[PDB]
Amino acid sequence: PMTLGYWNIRGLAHSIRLLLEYTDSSYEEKKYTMGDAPDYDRSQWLNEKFKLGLDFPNLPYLIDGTHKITQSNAILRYIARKHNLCGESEKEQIREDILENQFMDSRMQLAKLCYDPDFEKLKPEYLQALPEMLKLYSQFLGKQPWFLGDKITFVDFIAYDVLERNQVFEPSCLDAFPNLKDFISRFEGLEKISAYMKSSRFLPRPVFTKMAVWGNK
Template sequence: MRLEASENGKNEWVKDRYTIGLDFPNLPYLIDGNIKITQSNAILRYIGRKHKMCGDTEEERVRVDILESQAMDFRMQLVRVCHNPNFENMRLIYLQQLPKSLHLFSCFLGTRKWFAGKKMTFVDFSMYDILDLNLKFLPTCLDLFPNLQEFLTRFEGLKKISAYMNSPRYLPKPVFLKMAKWGTQ
């Protein structure tokens, strides 16, 4: 399995992107044998199915489906703020709404160990990422949500995640491209 992103270098990507057989040439992409996928969520869902991380019961699968879309909406709110020419004004509006959004995620997680249930699913990766991103944006944002803090700690405590985060390959920033008003350094 090969997952490619910007490490290929921009010039190489621009030159090769239409020659590797991707339906929609884009970064990131994943090539797993004959399977070729672009789009982050499609890649995550594929990996989730392959490793039986999409929920075991219908209730868990529904929770995964809901959370996958909700996490993307939540991420896109912050993306729009950070790429808006009127960043400071949009930032203030986002910060006013942030506790309500986090409260909903906190209620959805409840007392569960993972967002869909007892076992980790692929959406836990998305949720970790967006919660971590919001912590970088506002370090105190999870102060009122101990279950979300515990989720982050549990996720980071996983053996392979911890090893990766303690390796030189882990790059906590930048989180956005250079044209963003925040998260570029």
Template sequence: MAPILGYWNLRALVEPIVLTLKQAKQPYEYKTYKLGGAPDYDKSEWLKEKENLGLEYPNLPYYIDGDLKITQTLAILRYLGRKHDLGPKGEEETIRSDLIEQGVMEMLLSLFRAWYADNDQFYEANIIKLVPYLEQKFEHTSKVLGSNQFLLGDRVTYNDFLLYSTLDYIRLFKCSLLDPHQGLKDYLDRIEALPEIEPYFKDENFKRFPITGSMAKFGSGN
């Protein structure tokens, strides 16, 4: 029986996991939960199951493979990295991978904090702070990548899919932020051209939006 990956019907935190599974050629069942629109933002599909799946920390995304049940995005990614040889090797790579992982996750979560604003005024104030923050993080990320094909050299790891998803969301939000960083643009192209990944993006069912739920000021596709 194939593992089950559960998440809302949007990209957000699940996309790096999906890409890692595709790269690993791991069949899986993708169970999506509908997140309703305004004003109620109905979560009943998930709430009906939340406490009945045997999850220690009930949350989305989750990954269930027989008796193995994992929640939390990074925990799932690390597990898949170890299982499918898509993680760091040795202490030096592990330290570097941990550092990159936390840096990219910080950048990703900054997007959601800015986009999930209570009103337009708060959203505009958030964006004023977000843009210079991202400009600085792009400088750091460009240096981290350097002349490497991927984050840890010439071998793709789960962190590449975490970074890819984050950069893709940012270019959909404000593509000009990437203009000074041709290396990051080339990196995005390289990820999309991976033999196991390319068919996913070319599939007629693939959609860039929604990234976020309908309560967000950006990313819902509304």
């Protein structure tokens, strides 16, 4: 009944699919397929972009009855509130807002690099900064199981996605940060997550679109 639309890519829908599975949401998925170079045909999307009742037609989108949602973060927040997977105290909401935005910034830095035709020249640059970036997240998590404390929340589904895809970009990057390694194990070990990661539905790759220099397959 619920419908998640997005490319046949991990990208921005990863955290979402994971949240939908963790919350036991009843949903199905509409996967749009982009053609290959040099056109990268998007007609499969464009042909019904403005025919879905979306206020701001975009990918990913979530259609839950009367609620038609765009913007990944908004889609996550919607499902999160629906299952009380949100920060409660003021301190938890602050950390929740800071993280939601920080991780998106980090997500975009990697995407920017990977889509750039000068990926090879720019990559060293990114690798140099990775330890510093990871360290801030590591310090923030500290001895806590989840980014907001004792309860798992939606930022954890985001945290997971960007931290893990960095692990696949540079496998050794998390070695110096035990807690982030444990975060990833802790998350993948969750009952509903583990089961889903074994199913056919699980789509960890490709990370990006066919337009990427890295992660395109």
